[PDB]
Symmetry: C2
Subunit: 206 residues, 2 copies
């Protein structure tokens, strides 16, 4: 936490001074009063305050996540774009460690996202949309799954033998189901208890 | 940090306070430093590690909960229960939040493990109570739909919940189960026939 300490004739002035040096605005300032001054002709004594910028909402997201990734013994670069008027935060995670959890990225982006959102939203009277992603992983994940869907349809279609995908979170499972929604030769249906729950692709009947 | 033991080489020394500290070979860290001495502790428990992590996350959310964690080693399985007044702030949310915490915690525990550990997170049996009042919900709309002969859309819910519904009317010899909508507005639709 930044906190600059400022000094001046009265608390009132100190504040104004701090606003200038903080380049913030009245509605964006926290401060604590160290000492209100005095004068006495002239036993004068400056007023002193300590002041930061009032903490931002992206501030609170980053903080939460650093706290969590750190708890997870992981190194990650967080950055956020908040669109005030549109009321959405977009938070990108790049970083060497982010790379490790490969398949596991989906659900981990998901959980973390859900949480970051509780956190941001409890500090906010308006509802905020927080999206938590890595270098377009969500999109590029979607493509590759939709591709998986199509390729392994071909396989069933061709080998006549039924194929079970690896386990996946429901969100992804849906991408598959949908990818094959109207395939003339193949059908999909998901099985298993979580988290070993998968889609099965097999040839359509009747 | 650690404690000191002295014997013959390092091995007669290794076997030493392995006894004194009631621990076993797999769980014990070792510092290789007429005499012969070493340093050793009994390494961080998976519970120690689960509690650690959650403790940290709840700290980050400004909540004070009481975690407790039973762990059946032979089964390689760990049950975690949290509670306390502060869990009131999770009222509507509970399930999602419980699931999201569950995932990251499992994530952490298995990192620090060779054999795969199956971990479940739950406040005070909520998990089951919730399954129950949903199955009940399923059956009541089931009742209702064949009574209006029409058809109804339930509220939005996550997939986990949606499965619970589908499951409940899976056999229901008079009415159909269809999921629909777009997250976070995906719902089940029970329809006649």
């Amino acid at each position: 936490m930044d906190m600059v300490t400022v000094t001046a004739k009265t608390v009132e002035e100190a504040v104004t001074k701090a606003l200038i040096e903080l380049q913030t605005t009245s509605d964006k300032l926290t401060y604590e009063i160290v000492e209100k001054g005095s004068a006495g002709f002239i036993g004068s004594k400056p007023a002193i305050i300590r002041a930061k910028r009032k903490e931002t909402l992206q501030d609170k997201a980053i903080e939460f996540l650093e706290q969590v990734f750190d708890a997870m013994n992981m190194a990650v670069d967080i950055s956020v774009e908040y669109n005030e008027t549109e009321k959405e935060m977009n938070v990108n995670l790049k970083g060497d460690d982010m790379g490790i959890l490969i398949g596991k990225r989906g659900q981990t982006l998901d959980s973390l996202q859900y949480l970051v959102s509780l956190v941001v939203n409890k500090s906010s009277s308006d509802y905020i949309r927080v999206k938590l992603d890595t270098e377009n992983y969500r999109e590029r994940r979607k493509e590759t799954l939709e591709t998986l869907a199509k390729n392994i349809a071909y396989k069933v279609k061709r080998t006549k033998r039924s194929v079970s995908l690896e386990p996946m979170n429901p969100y992804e499972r849906r991408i598959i189901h949908a990818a094959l929604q109207n395939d003339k030769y193949v059908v999909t249906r998901s099985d298993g208890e979580e988290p070993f729950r998968h889609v099965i692709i097999s040839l359509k009947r009747e």
